[PDB]
RNA sequence: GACUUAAUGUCACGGUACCCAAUUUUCUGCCCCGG
């Protein structure tokens, strides 16, 4: 009559439910599921304190399970005193049911005992089952009960008013995956307890046999399971903070609001949980990074003014005010409240079944047989992360355990309390649900509402497995990865569709426990473990996880050690030890001499080559492909986030990542540049869709094209699984990014737009040092020869060069020079994978030809006046598909320089080392990367814009407005003196001009990319004989380009555009090079180096979906022929940068065929595209008096074309005895270098009394007309 | 103690929060008349 204090201690999270009586409980649907859980009562008026406890009942079930499975190992007999098997039915007529009914089978032995039980004496199973007694079903007393188990407490040691539930509970939802598809059927919601500091339970219990007494002590030690968690069982002797963030929260986003910049709200709530991987010093040391040089904005998003005051100078009071919260909590907070501040202001469930029915009623016996052996053996080792990981979880404010009842963009990762990321026990249960499916080849969907076990083979293997949850060491912040998506018309991103992701770092490392209790190890077991296990030669393939279609949450399994326990001779030690439960930990670093006697390694262990599930079910699943990337041009993937929180005012920086170390604990230092794998899995995704034109279609419900088999939809997942480009090369370079800056330029002025410069900072790809990226991808098996032909066309199109990486592919960045596939690929994706002269002679103007003596003086520059009508045409075409009657190929092109050449490298203005003396002096070097002379692709570009503009009358692209004039005020602004047709396109709505047809806008993309020019011949570095280095050349002043010299009154609007001429005026300034470093300030001048004439550049233009005058017009625009050239670079009112283009070669391929192949394009084909444009020309003109026919064209006969051939002809070039001269006029009679009586001041070309205004402009709109004896 | 179980019968270690979506489109580091 004693009794027993137990307690029971936990070592994963449990599983907790509300408690109902009986019929309250029938009632409802999650206390239905949530029996053999732990109850939670409420305590007081309303609904947030209360209690947990644990039924008598549930550990009256365990300990009976536990008893009959300890009878059934040693046959029926305890210690030597043999017991009969029970009795687990209930007649309905005679007695109710007893409110719990049991669907599993019942372990038998033979009766063996020569008595029967009754009331007198009594086997000890019968004792303990609760039969010959009193107060049964119907409770009345605590006497006469046999043994009884009472209620089992929450041991709270600071129990001192309430518990609530939101500190013990944390709620979650889970989830049942089909096979096949791979999409979720149902969800369902549970409630996690913490066992840390709340995981001991105390109880009692009583008995009046030792008969009992015996068994029951020693069946207390072999219960190794109870509500959802390993048990070891014994015997003894802050609202008012979310408020006030929330109220500042919202004033923050009415500030935004009320400046109509609303839209910017998103990219700051995670600019501040990106704050939380910073120090807090980031927002006391002020080192945000501000704008550039302009004091009126400031920057661009963290000087928006917040009542008064900035947003840094708002962050800093805000986190004065909340200093005791943390720093980590306080950005996730803050972060938070926006996020959902903006999305409420922009703006199924299936438990198991009820059985009251007929159903069954049965009783199931199973006898093993009595010669067997049951063992249990335990498998400990680690698992590491291969790729990044991830976990999804709902978000918090929508999981709160007390309340429960426009999808969201934003997705957290699982933690722990104390922020450690967590492998939960239902991820990896399922994971080795899905692999041990695979191996046995045949598995059923799994069946909630069940009368019947399942008897595969997968549900039988499965009912002997144990695990246990793991967190790992680390507590660092997550990373959060971003994604967009493209409209496929217009190849630019659509708004609302970006979302974001938060990911875990590779390479940590988490425990893992798993246990196995049966009669002989399964081989699918094994074959499964040896699938997860990564050795030398093989990776591991444990897919855990939840974006597996980006390649995150591949896992491998290090240092297994597999033990074993003998139950049937050493079940002592088993009771004495619990299985070592909650002391897994101390088995992976126990020598074979320290181990608990009863455990012994087990040497038994099937080897991969071995296993048969392995070799035909699990190895051929997934397919490895590995390839390197050989990119020879910058390379940028921007950031966006991370350019606004490092310090450095960048614009565009970069991608990197973080990378933990195991050898030491902490992260690694230097992070690792990489492309993502969302990137070229879209890269892949759109080079299939726009061959097989499945991009095209409006609606993917239900569909079962090419690209939604190959690349999943929302019914079915993907069979293609993409993982990072990482840089395996960026040890040998110096200098790895590289500072490039650019700028805008304007069309009438002819310099630079005001504060339109920008810069970036992408990896330094050099033609001779290229970066190498490593990617790999798997493939599912089942793929049919088509798929992988379309999967290797698509690597074929990334290797010729129609795809670049990253952003800025226009002008040049991320161009792909080469890919490499290394020998482990199956032999059928290697197998599958392996002059022109134009001869136009133009007429040039007959008063720099007549002289030829050269006294005339010219102005170096004048103005294109193509009137006011421009053609806006309203079928754009798109970029879903390759088209059949459009063109796409590339042009090879070489570019020789006539006069000397400056590209300067702006990023340092000392580099040349010329400042330590004289100092403000800017001195430049050439552009280069690596060592290398190159010329920059949006230089070429923005050329070849304004003469293709100037040709076919589009639009002034780049034009400034706000600009007024004073000579006395003006009227309305330099912007509204512009016609209305002049003005830059906005939106595809009104139509597109030609050129922003061809080159593109900020809704539209551009069908022209051009690339990086690289120097190849000749010679270089124009030699001055007295100078500091022997290159080097110190310019003139070159200053601002002043509008009222062509609009000098009220009336007489704009002159259209402005092109300088060709003149050999370098060879003044090469002389009086001591004329020039004397007398003018250093402040004023630009030092740079030279290249002489006759170096031999070489590009490449790369177009796509071209009409046939399209790229005749293109053509024409490259080579306009003998005596024409183009200007480039700096210094060019002087005479520097006259380049010549000649075509060398034209490719065009034909994709929608037959066979992809790569043409010629022979000279026939091309003067037909240079005829069509022609005749193109002159139907947009009107003129229909010229006939048409096989005559090669006289570009002259149209005006506009007659004025810019003469703007850009070169008379010096056929080796004439002509050069003209051409140069400013000098101010007054007194100030540099007059010339004795010539009157070329601008103080005789400025009044109304030499030449009226209208006269001015009239010389400035002519080319060539001589102004030094007015004409 | 009660709050807070019923007792000859609890496979909820009977269920992966899973699935689809390229941070990108456009822009020559350029340039002479007065205060
Ligand atoms: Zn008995
Ligand atoms: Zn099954
Ligand atoms: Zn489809
Ligand atoms: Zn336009």
């Given at each position: 009559?004693?009794?027993?204090?137990?307690?029971?201690?936990?070592?994963?999270?449990?599983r907790?439910?509300?408690?109902?009586?009986?019929?309250?409980?029938?009632?409802?649907?999650?206390?239905m599921?949530?029996?053999?859980?732990?109850?939670?009562?409420?305590?007081?008026?309303?609904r947030?304190?209360?209690?947990?406890?644990?039924?008598?009942?549930?550990?009256?079930?365990?300990?009976?399970?536990?008893?009959?499975?300890?009878?059934?190992?040693?046959?029926?007999?305890?210690?030597?005193?043999?017991?009969?098997?029970?009795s687990?039915?209930?007649?309905?007529?005679?007695?109710?049911?007893?409110?719990?009914?049991?669907?599993?089978?019942?372990?038998?032995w033979?009766?063996n005992?020569?008595?029967?039980?009754?009331?007198?004496?009594?086997?000890?199973?019968?004792?303990?089952?609760?039969?010959?007694?009193?107060?049964?079903?119907?409770?009345?007393?605590?006497?006469d009960?046999?043994?009884?188990?009472?209620?089992?407490?929450?041991?709270?040691?600071?129990?001192?008013?309430?518990?609530?539930?939101?500190?013990?509970?944390?709620?979650?939802?889970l989830?049942?995956?089909?096979?096949?598809?791979?999409?979720?059927?149902?969800?369902?919601?549970?409630?996690?307890?913490?066992?840390?500091?709340?995981?001991?339970?105390?109880?009692?219990?009583?008995?009046?046999?030792?008969?009992?007494?015996?068994?029951?002590?020693?069946?207390?030690?072999?219960?190794?399971?109870?509500?959802?968690?390993?048990?070891?069982?014994?015997?003894?002797?802050?609202?008012?903070?979310?408020?006030?963030?929330?109220?500042?929260?919202?004033?923050?986003?009415?500030?935004?609001?009320?400046?109509?910049?609303?839209?910017?709200?998103?990219?700051?709530?995670?600019?501040?949980?990106?704050?939380?991987?910073?120090?807090?010093?980031?927002?006391?040391?002020?080192?945000?990074?501000?704008?550039?040089?302009?004091?009126?904005?400031?920057?661009?998003?963290?000087?928006?003014?917040?009542?008064?005051?900035?947003?840094?100078?708002?962050?800093?009071?805000?986190?004065?005010?909340?200093?005791?919260?943390?720093?980590?909590?306080?950005?996730?907070?803050?972060?938070s409240?926006?996020?959902?501040?903006?999305?409420?202001?922009?703006?199924?469930?299936?438990?198991?079944?009820?059985?009251?029915?007929?159903?069954?009623?049965?009783?199931?016996?199973?006898?093993?047989?009595?010669?067997?052996?049951?063992?249990?053996?335990?498998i400990?080792?680690?698992?590491?992360?291969?790729?990044?990981?991830?976990?999804?979880?709902?978000?918090?404010?929508?999981?709160?355990?007390?309340?429960?009842?426009?999808?969201?963009?934003?997705?957290?990762?699982?933690?722990?309390?104390?922020?450690?990321?967590?492998?939960?026990?239902?991820?990896?249960?399922?994971?080795?649900?899905?692999?041990?499916?695979?191996?046995?080849?045949?598995?059923?969907?799994?069946?909630?509402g069940?009368?019947?076990?399942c008897?595969?083979?997968?549900?039988?293997?499965?009912?002997?497995?144990?695990?246990?949850?793991?967190?790992?060491?680390?507590?660092?912040?997550?990373?959060?990865?971003?994604?967009?998506?493209?409209?496929?018309?217009?190849?630019?991103?659509?708004?609302?569709?970006?979302?974001?992701?938060?990911?875990?770092?590779?390479?940590?490392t988490?425990?893992?426990?798993?246990?196995?209790?049966?009669?002989?190890?399964?081989?699918?077991?094994?074959?499964?473990?040896?699938?997860?296990?990564?050795?030398?030669?093989?990776?591991?393939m444990?897919?855990?996880?939840?974006?597996?279609?980006?390649?995150?949450?591949?896992?491998?399994?290090?240092?297994?050690?597999?033990?074993?326990?003998?139950?049937n001779?050493?079940?002592?030690?088993?009771?004495?030890?619990?299985?070592?439960?909650?002391?897994?930990?101390?088995?992976?670093?126990?020598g074979?001499?320290?181990?608990?006697?009863?455990?012994?390694?087990?040497?038994?262990?099937?080897?991969?080559?071995?296993?048969?599930?392995?070799?035909?079910?699990?190895?051929?699943?997934?397919?490895?492909?590995?390839?390197?990337?050989?990119?020879?041009?910058?390379?940028?993937?921007?950031?966006?986030?991370?350019?606004?929180?490092?310090?450095?005012?960048?614009?565009?920086?970069?991608?990197?990542?973080?990378?933990?170390?195991?050898?030491?604990?902490?992260?690694?230092?230097?992070?690792?540049?990489?492309?993502?794998?969302?990137?070229?899995?879209?890269?892949?995704?759109?080079?299939?869709?726009?061959?097989?034109?499945?991009?095209?279609?409006?609606?993917?419900?239900?569909?079962?094209?090419?690209?939604?088999?190959?690349?999943?939809?929302?019914?079915?997942?993907?069979?293609?699984?993409?993982?990072?480009?990482?840089?395996?090369?960026?040890?040998e370079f110096?200098?790895?990014?590289?500072?490039?800056?650019?700028?805008?330029?304007?069309?009438?002025?002819?310099?630079?737009?005001?504060?339109?410069?920008?810069?970036?900072?992408?990896?330094?790809?050099?033609?001779?040092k290229?970066?190498?990226?490593?990617?790999?991808?798997?493939?599912?098996?089942?793929?049919?020869?088509?798929?992988?032909?379309?999967?290797?066309?698509?690597?074929?199109?990334?290797?010729?060069?129609?795809?670049?990486?990253?952003?800025?592919?226009?002008?040049?960045?991320?161009?792909?020079?080469?890919?490499?596939?290394?020998?482990?690929?199956?032999?059928?994706?290697?197998?599958?994978?392996?002059?022109?002269?134009?001869?136009?002679?133009?007429?040039?103007?007959?008063?720099?030809?007549?002289?030829?003596?050269?006294?005339?003086?010219?102005?170096?520059?004048?103005?294109?006046?193509?009137?006011?009508?421009?053609?806006?045409?309203?079928?754009?075409?798109?970029?879903?598909?390759?088209?059949?009657?459009?063109?796409?190929?590339?042009?090879?092109?070489?570019?020789?320089?006539?006069?000397?050449?400056?590209?300067?490298?702006?990023?340092?203005?000392?580099?040349?080392?010329?400042?330590?003396?004289?100092?403000?002096?800017?001195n430049?070097?050439?552009?280069?990367?690596?060592?290398?002379?190159?010329?920059?692709?949006?230089?070429?570009?923005?050329?070849?814009?304004?003469?293709?503009?100037?040709?076919?009358?589009?639009?002034?692209?780049?034009?400034?407005?706000?600009?007024?004039?004073?000579?006395?005020?003006?009227?309305?602004?330099?912007?509204?003196?512009?016609?209305?047709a002049?003005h830059?396109?906005?939106?595809?709505?009104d139509?597109?001009?030609?050129?922003?047809?061809?080159?593109?806008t900020?809704?539209?993309?551009?069908?022209?990319?051009?690339?990086?020019?690289?120097?190849?011949?000749?010679?270089?570095?124009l030699?001055?004989?007295?100078?500091?280095?022997?290159?080097?050349?110190?310019?003139?002043?070159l200053?601002?380009?002043?509008?009222?010299?062509?609009?000098?009154?009220?009336?007489?609007?704009?002159?259209?555009?402005?092109?300088?001429?060709?003149?050999?005026?370098?060879?003044?300034?090469?002389?009086?090079?001591?004329?020039?470093?004397?007398?003018?300030?250093?402040?004023?001048?630009?030092?740079?180096?030279?290249?002489?004439?006759?170096?031999?550049?070489?590009?490449?233009?790369?177009?796509?979906?071209?009409?046939?005058?399209?790229?005749?017009?293109?053509?024409?625009?490259?080579?306009?022929?003998?005596?024409?050239?183009?200007?480039?670079?700096?210094?060019?009112?002087?005479?520097?940068?006259?380049?010549?283009?000649?075509?060398?070669?034209?490719?065009?391929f034909?994709?929608?065929?037959?066979?992809?192949?790569?043409?010629?394009?022979?000279?026939?084909?091309?003067?037909?595209?240079?005829?069509?444009?022609?005749?193109?020309?002159?139907?947009?003109?009107?003129?229909?008096?010229?006939?048409?026919?096989?005559?090669?064209?006289?570009?002259?006969?149209?005006?506009?074309?007659?004025?810019?051939?003469?703007?850009?002809?070169?008379?010096?070039?056929?080796?004439?005895?002509?050069?003209?001269?051409?140069?400013?006029?000098?101010?007054?009679?007194?100030?540099?270098?007059?010339?004795?009586?010539?009157?070329?001041?601008?103080?005789?070309?400025?009044?109304?009394?030499?030449?009226?205004?209208?006269?001015?402009?009239?010389?400035?709109?002519?080319?060539?007309?001589?102004?030094?004896?007015?004409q």
């Amino acid at each position: 009559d004693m009794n027993i204090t137990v307690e029971l201690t936990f070592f994963e999270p449990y599983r907790l439910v509300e408690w109902f009586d009986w019929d309250a409980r029938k009632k409802s649907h999650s206390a239905m599921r949530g029996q053999a859980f732990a109850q939670w009562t409420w305590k007081g008026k309303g609904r947030t304190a209360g209690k947990s406890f644990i039924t008598g009942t549930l550990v009256r079930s365990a300990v009976i399970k536990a008893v009959e499975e300890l009878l059934s190992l040693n046959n029926g007999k305890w210690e030597g005193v043999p017991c009969c098997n029970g009795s687990f039915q209930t007649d309905e007529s005679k007695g109710k049911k007893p409110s719990f009914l049991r669907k599993r089978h019942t372990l038998q032995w033979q009766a063996n005992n020569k008595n029967i039980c009754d009331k007198e004496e009594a086997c000890p199973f019968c004792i303990l089952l609760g039969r010959f007694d009193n107060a049964g079903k119907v409770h009345e007393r605590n006497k006469d009960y046999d043994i009884h188990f009472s209620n089992f407490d929450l041991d709270h040691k600071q129990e001192k008013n309430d518990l609530r539930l939101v500190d013990i509970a944390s709620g979650r939802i889970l989830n049942r995956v089909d096979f096949d598809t791979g999409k979720a059927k149902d969800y369902f919601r549970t409630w996690e307890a913490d066992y840390e500091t709340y995981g001991t339970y105390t109880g009692r219990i009583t008995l009046r046999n030792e008969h009992a007494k015996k068994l029951l002590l020693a069946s207390l030690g072999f219960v190794d399971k109870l509500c959802g968690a390993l048990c070891r069982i014994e015997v003894i002797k802050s609202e008012d903070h979310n408020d006030e963030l929330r109220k500042q929260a919202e004033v923050i986003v009415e500030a935004f609001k009320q400046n109509d910049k609303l839209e910017k709200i998103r990219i700051l709530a995670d600019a501040i949980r990106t704050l939380r991987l910073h120090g807090e010093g980031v927002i006391e040391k002020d080192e945000l990074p501000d704008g550039k040089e302009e004091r009126d904005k400031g920057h661009h998003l963290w000087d928006i003014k917040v009542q008064g005051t900035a947003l840094r100078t708002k962050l800093k009071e805000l986190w004065q005010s909340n200093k005791d919260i943390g720093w980590r909590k306080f950005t996730e907070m803050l972060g938070s409240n926006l996020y959902l501040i903006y999305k409420k202001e922009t703006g199924t469930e299936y438990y198991s079944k009820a059985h009251d029915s007929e159903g069954s009623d049965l009783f199931i016996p199973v006898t093993p047989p009595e010669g067997i052996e049951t063992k249990e053996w335990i498998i400990v080792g680690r698992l590491k992360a291969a790729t990044p990981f991830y976990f999804g979880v709902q978000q918090p404010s929508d999981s709160i355990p007390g309340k429960e009842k426009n999808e969201h963009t934003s997705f957290n990762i699982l933690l722990d309390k104390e922020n450690r990321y967590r492998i939960p026990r239902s991820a990896l249960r399922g994971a080795l649900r899905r692999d041990l499916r695979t191996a046995f080849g045949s598995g059923c969907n799994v069946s909630l509402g069940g009368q019947i076990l399942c008897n595969c083979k997968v549900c039988i293997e499965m009912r002997r497995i144990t695990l246990k949850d793991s967190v790992s060491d680390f507590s660092e912040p997550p990373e959060i990865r971003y994604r967009i998506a493209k409209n496929p018309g217009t190849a630019t991103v659509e708004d609302g569709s970006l979302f974001d992701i938060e990911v875990g770092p590779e390479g940590l490392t988490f425990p893992f426990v798993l246990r196995y209790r049966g009669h002989k190890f399964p081989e699918q077991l094994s074959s499964v473990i040896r699938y997860w296990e990564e050795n030398d030669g093989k990776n591991g393939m444990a897919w855990l996880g939840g974006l597996d279609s980006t390649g995150k949450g591949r896992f491998a399994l290090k240092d297994i050690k597999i033990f074993e326990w003998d139950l049937n001779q050493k079940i002592n030690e088993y009771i004495k030890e619990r299985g070592m439960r909650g002391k897994e930990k101390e088995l992976l670093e126990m020598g074979e001499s320290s181990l608990p006697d009863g455990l012994i390694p087990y040497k038994f262990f099937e080897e991969r080559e071995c296993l048969f599930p392995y070799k035909e079910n699990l190895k051929p699943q997934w397919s490895e492909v590995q390839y390197t990337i050989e990119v020879g041009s910058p390379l940028l993937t921007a950031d966006t986030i991370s350019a606004l929180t490092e310090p450095g005012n960048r614009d565009a920086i970069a991608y990197k990542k973080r990378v933990y170390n195991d050898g030491n604990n902490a992260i690694e230092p230097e992070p690792r540049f990489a492309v993502k794998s969302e990137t070229h899995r879209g890269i892949f995704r759109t080079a299939v869709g726009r061959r097989t034109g499945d991009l095209g279609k409006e609606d993917h419900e239900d569909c079962t094209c090419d690209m939604c088999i190959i690349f999943g939809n929302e019914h079915e997942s993907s069979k293609i699984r993409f993982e990072d480009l990482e840089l395996i090369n960026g040890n040998e370079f110096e200098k790895l990014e590289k500072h490039i800056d650019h700028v805008a330029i304007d069309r009438f002025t002819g310099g630079a737009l005001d504060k339109a410069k920008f810069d970036t900072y992408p990896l330094a790809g050099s033609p001779k040092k290229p970066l190498k990226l490593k990617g790999r991808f798997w493939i599912k098996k089942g793929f049919s020869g088509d798929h992988k032909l379309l999967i290797t066309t698509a690597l074929s199109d990334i290797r010729d060069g129609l795809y670049p990486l990253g952003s800025k592919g226009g002008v040049g960045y991320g161009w792909v020079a080469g890919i490499s596939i290394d020998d482990n690929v199956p032999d059928d994706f290697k197998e599958m994978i392996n002059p022109i002269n134009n001869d136009y002679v133009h007429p040039g103007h007959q008063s720099p030809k007549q002289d030829h003596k050269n006294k005339n003086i010219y102005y170096p520059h004048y103005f294109l006046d193509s009137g006011s009508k421009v053609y806006r045409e309203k079928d754009i075409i798109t970029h879903e598909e390759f088209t059949e009657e459009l063109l796409s190929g590339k042009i090879n092109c070489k570019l020789e320089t006539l006069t000397p050449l400056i590209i300067p490298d702006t990023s340092d203005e000392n580099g040349l080392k010329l400042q330590g003396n004289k100092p403000g002096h800017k001195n430049y070097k050439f552009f280069n990367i690596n060592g290398e002379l190159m010329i920059p692709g949006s230089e070429l570009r923005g050329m070849l814009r304004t003469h293709f503009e100037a040709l076919t009358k589009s639009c002034f692209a780049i034009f400034g407005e706000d600009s007024t004039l004073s000579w006395k005020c003006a009227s309305k602004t330099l912007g509204g003196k512009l016609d209305k047709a002049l003005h830059p396109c906005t939106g595809l709505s009104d139509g597109l001009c030609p050129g922003c047809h061809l080159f593109g806008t900020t809704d539209y993309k551009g069908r022209v990319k051009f690339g990086f020019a690289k120097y190849e011949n000749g010679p270089e570095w124009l030699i001055t004989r007295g100078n500091n280095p022997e290159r080097s050349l110190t310019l003139g002043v070159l200053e601002s380009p002043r509008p009222a010299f062509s609009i000098p009154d009220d009336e007489s609007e704009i002159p259209g555009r402005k092109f300088y001429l060709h003149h050999n005026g370098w060879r003044i300034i090469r002389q009086k090079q001591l004329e020039i470093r004397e007398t003018v300030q250093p402040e004023r001048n630009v030092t740079t180096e030279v290249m002489d004439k006759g170096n031999v550049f070489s590009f490449d233009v790369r177009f796509e979906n071209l009409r046939e005058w399209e790229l005749g017009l293109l053509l024409q625009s490259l080579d306009p022929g003998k005596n024409i050239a183009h200007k480039l670079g700096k210094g060019k009112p002087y005479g520097f940068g006259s380049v010549k283009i000649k075509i060398d070669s034209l490719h065009t391929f034909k994709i929608n065929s037959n066979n992809d192949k790569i043409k010629r394009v022979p000279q026939s084909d091309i003067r037909e595209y240079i005829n069509k444009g022609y005749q193109k020309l002159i139907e947009w003109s009107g003129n229909n008096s010229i006939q048409k026919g096989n005559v090669l064209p006289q570009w002259h006969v149209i005006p506009h074309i007659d004025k810019l051939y003469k703007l850009l002809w070169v008379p010096f070039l056929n080796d004439s005895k002509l050069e003209p001269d051409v140069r400013y006029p000098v101010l007054n009679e007194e100030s540099k270098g007059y010339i004795e009586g010539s009157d070329y001041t601008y103080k005789k070309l400025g009044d109304k009394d030499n030449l009226p205004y209208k006269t001015r402009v009239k010389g400035l709109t002519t080319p060539w007309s001589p102004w030094n004896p007015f004409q």
